[PDB]
Amino acid sequence: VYQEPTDPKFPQQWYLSGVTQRDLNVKAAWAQGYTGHGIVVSILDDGIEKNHPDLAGNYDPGASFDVNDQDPDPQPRYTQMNDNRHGTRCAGEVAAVANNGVCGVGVAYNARIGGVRMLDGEVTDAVEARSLGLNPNHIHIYSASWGPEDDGKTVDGPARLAEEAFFRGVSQGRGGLGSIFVWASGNGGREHDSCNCDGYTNSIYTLSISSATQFGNVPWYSEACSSTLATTYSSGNQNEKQIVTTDLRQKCTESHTGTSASAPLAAGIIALTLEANKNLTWRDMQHLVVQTSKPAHLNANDWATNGVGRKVSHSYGYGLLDAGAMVALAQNWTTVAPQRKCIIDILTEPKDIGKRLEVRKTVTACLGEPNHITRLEHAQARLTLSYNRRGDLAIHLVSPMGTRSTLLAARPHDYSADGFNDWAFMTTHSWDEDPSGEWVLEIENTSEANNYGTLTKFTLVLYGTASGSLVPR
Amino acid sequence: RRRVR
Ligand SMILES: [Ca+2]
Ligand SMILES: [Ca+2]
Ligand SMILES: [Ca+2]
Ligand SMILES: [Cl-]
Ligand code: NA
Ligand code: NA
Ligand code: NA
Ligand code: NA
Numbered sequence: 085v086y087q088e089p090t091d092p093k094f095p096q097q098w099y100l101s102g103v104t105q106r107d108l109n110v111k112a113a114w115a116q117g118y119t120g121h122g123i124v125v126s127i128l129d130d131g132i133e134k135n136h137p138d139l140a141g142n143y144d145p146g147a148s149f150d151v152n153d154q155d156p157d158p159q160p161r162y163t164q165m166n167d168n169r170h171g172t173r174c175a176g177e178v179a180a181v182a183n184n185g186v187c188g189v190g191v192a193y194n195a196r197i198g199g200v201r202m203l204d205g206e207v208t209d210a211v212e213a214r215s216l217g218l219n220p221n222h223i224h225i226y227s228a229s230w231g232p233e234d235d236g237k238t239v240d241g242p243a244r245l246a247e248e249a250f251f252r253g254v255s256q257g258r259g260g261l262g263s264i265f266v267w268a269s270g271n272g273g274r275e276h277d278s279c280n281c282d283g284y285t286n287s288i289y290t291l292s293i294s295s296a297t298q299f300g301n302v303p304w305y306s307e308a309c310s311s312t313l314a315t316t317y318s319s320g321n322q323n324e325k326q327i328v329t330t331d332l333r334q335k336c337t338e339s340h341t342g343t344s345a346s347a348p349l350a351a352g353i354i355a356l357t358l359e360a361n362k363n364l365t366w367r368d369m370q371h372l373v374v375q376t377s378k379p380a381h382l383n384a385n386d387w388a389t390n391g392v393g394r395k396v397s398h399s400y401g402y403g404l405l406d407a408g409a410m411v412a413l414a415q416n417w418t419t420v421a422p423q424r425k426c427i428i429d430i431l432t433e434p435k436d437i438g439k440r441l442e443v444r445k446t447v448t449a450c451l452g453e454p455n456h457i458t459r460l461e462h463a464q465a466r467l468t469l470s471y472n473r474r475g476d477l478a479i480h481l482v483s484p485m486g487t488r489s490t491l492l493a494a495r496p497h498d499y500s501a502d503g504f505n506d507w508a509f510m511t512t513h514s515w516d517e518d519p520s521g522e523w524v525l526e527i528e529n530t531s532e533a534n535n536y537g538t539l540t541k542f543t544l545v546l547y548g549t550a551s552g553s554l555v556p557r
Numbered sequence: 558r559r560r561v562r
Contacts, residue, residue, distance in 0.1 A: 130562065170562045207560035230562055344562065 086115040093188040099317035112408030120192025123355040129171030131160030132199025138180040147198020152205035169332035176330030177348035187336035188328040191352025213245035220257035225264040227351035229344035234272030236497040241283015250289040262366030265290040268347035270307040279309035288462040293350040298324035308398040310489040310511035314377040315400040316349040360411040379403035391485020391517040393557035421549040426450035430542040457548040464545040470503040471537030483514040484521030
């Protein structure tokens with residue numbers, strides 16, 4: 085009885101549905117009755133063409149603002165180079181109108197879509213904070229296909245106002261259930277960038293989303309890191325198809341590309357999921373992503389099975405999003421228990437790094453206390469260290485269940501002598517593991533140079549609960 | 558740029 089969209093470019097939307105099973109299984113969610121109705125998504129970017137033939141029907145001024153010019157109207161600034169097309173492309177991936185004879189369809193083609201014009205100007209901490217904190221009891225899901233520069237030498241994250249916006253959003257947004265923040269993990273693949281050097285993707289409050297090519301490969305632009313949660317399809321080489329979406333000047337494009345295309349698709353899938361259960365918290369949503377994402381037929385050299393039997397890759401997180409599985413699991417979902425936080429200061433003295441440093445610590449994870457954690461969610465290694473050439477470092481963290489997370493891989497372009505100042509390297513790879521027992525931090529010099537430095541602080545921060553585990557996969 | 562697309 086469900087009739088798939090008739091839009092002219094819908095047959096080119098290979099990532100929404102195919103018989104090949106190289107897709108996000110979005111039609112299966114549409115057939116269950118979930119198309120995004122009642123859900124509000126905002127695209128934080130360079131503006132949104134609110135009069136676009138394939139966005140006007142879903143456009144929501146309540147989900148929109150212009151922070152660059154301080155006005156309500158997020159219309160892009162038109163230039164000859166069409167520099168401000170980026171947000172309009174992202175928006176159509178989420179919520180382009182279906183069955184209207186124009187272009188293709190959004191993942192959540194009955195959701196309401198807005199945009200925050202905030203990248204077309206100097207993007208300060210205050211600009212980010214006003215954007216992330218926009219109308220947080222009307223907008224459900226925020227999508228951000230932007231971040232710190234992907235030059236492979238930057239270590240940067242949200243400053244104080246933006247970090248406050250994240251915390252306010254997950255605590256008080258969406259009626260106390262928490263704003264959903266979806267982040268593109270980055271385009272720094274060619275620079276050998278790591279998305280753990282990016283505090284937006286590295287945040288526990290964002291769902292960081294990576295990309296896979298049509299043929300199931302790690303795209304040239306992809307950044308590997310342990311903070312990535314899951315993956316959606318995007319562009320690859322010139323024999324692989326690309327993303328079909330709304331373009332600036334009321335046009336349709338079949339060549340949207342990069343990390344920028346993956347976050348909006350994830351935001352659309354999450355919109356469908358919220359429609360299936362409006363009572364999901366921001367942490368519920370990450371649990372659903374972990375449990376339902378699919379590694380199958382994604383190619384990587386680093387797939388590993390964690391302590392609860394789930395396959396995880398630094399290129400892909402838990403794998404490809406599966407919209408049908410998300411909405412099915414969401415319907416009878418039991419809200420997770422309140423989040424506990426266990427802070428473990430690991431060092432008793434500073435340690436010289438030299439060629440290699442291994443720090444082992446057996447922990448009880450707040451045994452006997454109200455923040456006792458037996459079911460891990462995010463884990464952070466907050467490191468403070470000095471070093472003469474930062475990009476020569478590789479850092480690994482091994483959980484008691486034997487799961488080895490690459491917190492930091494070598495970055496050939498990172499020549500910095502600034503080290504790390506309480507940088508919160510985050511891993512999702514030990515999700516649902518029991519964190520009691522021996523943790524191992526490994527810091528190594530990957531170069532033949534005679535480098536030198538000192539690890540002066542290692543705080544292991546565990547988040548999670550103490551109830552409700554599933555039998556391991 | 559501090560932040561890029
Ligand atoms: Ca404006
Ligand atoms: Ca359409
Ligand atoms: Ca990056
Ligand atoms: Cl916290
Ligand atoms: Na709350
Ligand atoms: Na994140
Ligand atoms: Na243990
Ligand atoms: Na051991």
